[PDB]
């Protein structure tokens, strides 16, 4: 039960055309800004702010409380990206750049120190363990018809 005019249309250079589209999408004429006329097929669809959908007012009486949406309002091109079940752009207590710097620094320092500790291992002042029968030759692999070189152990 929807007319042809209601459906999305190609990006319009003219102001009169722009005004018609802004009225169609139920938003103010100077509040409407389409995607740039590039090769991609956005056409005549408003470029709503990339503001997420988790951080909408949680106390407003939305028509769809779970999605935080109102009936009839324009829908973001990437709503399925922001449904509170996926990526959200909620402002964080610490800046994004400093968060990335701190996390990368911690991980890199941990890796470097693990490698350094691998270079300088830790052990105890003991000699290698001694096993009686030719370093347990028969019990490790077998091959009894080869008569391996016999290793003797030094009592001290």
């Amino acid at each position: 039960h929807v007319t042809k005019d209601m459906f999305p249309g190609p990006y319009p250079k003219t102001p009169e055309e722009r005004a018609a589209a802004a009225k169609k999408y139920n938003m103010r004429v100077e509040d409407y800004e389409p995607y740039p006329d590039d090769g991609m097929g956005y056409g005549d669809y408003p470029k709503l702010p990339d503001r997420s959908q988790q951080e909408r007012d949680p106390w407003y009486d939305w028509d769809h409380p779970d999605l935080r949406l109102n009936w009839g309002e324009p829908i973001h091109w990437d709503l399925d990206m922001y449904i509170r079940n996926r990526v959200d752009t909620s402002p964080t207590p610490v800046s994004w750049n400093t968060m990335c710097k701190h996390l990368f620094g911690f991980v890199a320092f941990m890796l470097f120190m693990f490698w350094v500790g691998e270079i300088y291992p830790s052990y105890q002042p003991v000699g290698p363990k001694q096993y009686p029968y030719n370093d347990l030759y028969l019990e490790r692999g077998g091959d009894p018809t080869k008569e391996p070189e016999p290793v003797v152990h030094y009592e001290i």
């Binding site: 190609p10 139920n26 090769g39 009936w71 990526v87 994004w96």
Partner: protein
């Protein structure tokens, strides 16, 4: 003085730290009035259609249908071949294929060469 909060794409500027609503002019108040007016008009229409005892169906949402049509069936008619679109298409649709072909071809060539030399130790490799 305190360190400044620098917003990013995935951490947007908070409304409280935003400076747009501190430089208030009468036209801004008029704009907010019009926004609230159209929002209330839509809300009144929805509520009138929603509490009707005679209605026994789903309230058709023009916004949802418009969004679905824009996402699915309106991409090609607004598509134009441009250097950006052409380059992105060529890259993202050709590069991965040839990259994976080169990787697998090199791996299989190395494996076949090792097989021909016989230095692979394929013992117990019964199932294939």
């Amino acid at each position: 003085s305190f360190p400044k909060y620098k917003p990013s794409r995935l951490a947007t500027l908070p409304a409280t730290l935003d400076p747009a609503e501190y430089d208030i002019s009468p036209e801004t108040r008029k704009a907010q009035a019009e926004r609230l007016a159209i929002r209330s008009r839509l809300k009144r229409e929805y509520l009138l259609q929603y509490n009707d005892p005679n209605r026994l169906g789903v309230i058709e949402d023009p916004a949802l249908i418009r969004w679905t049509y824009a996402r699915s069936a309106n991409i090609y008619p607004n598509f134009r071949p441009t250097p950006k679109t052409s380059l992105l298409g060529a890259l993202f649709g050709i590069g991965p294929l040839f990259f994976w072909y080169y990787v697998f071809k090199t791996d299989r060539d190395k494996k076949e060469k090792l097989i021909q030399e016989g230095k692979l130790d394929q013992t117990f490799n019964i199932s294939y």
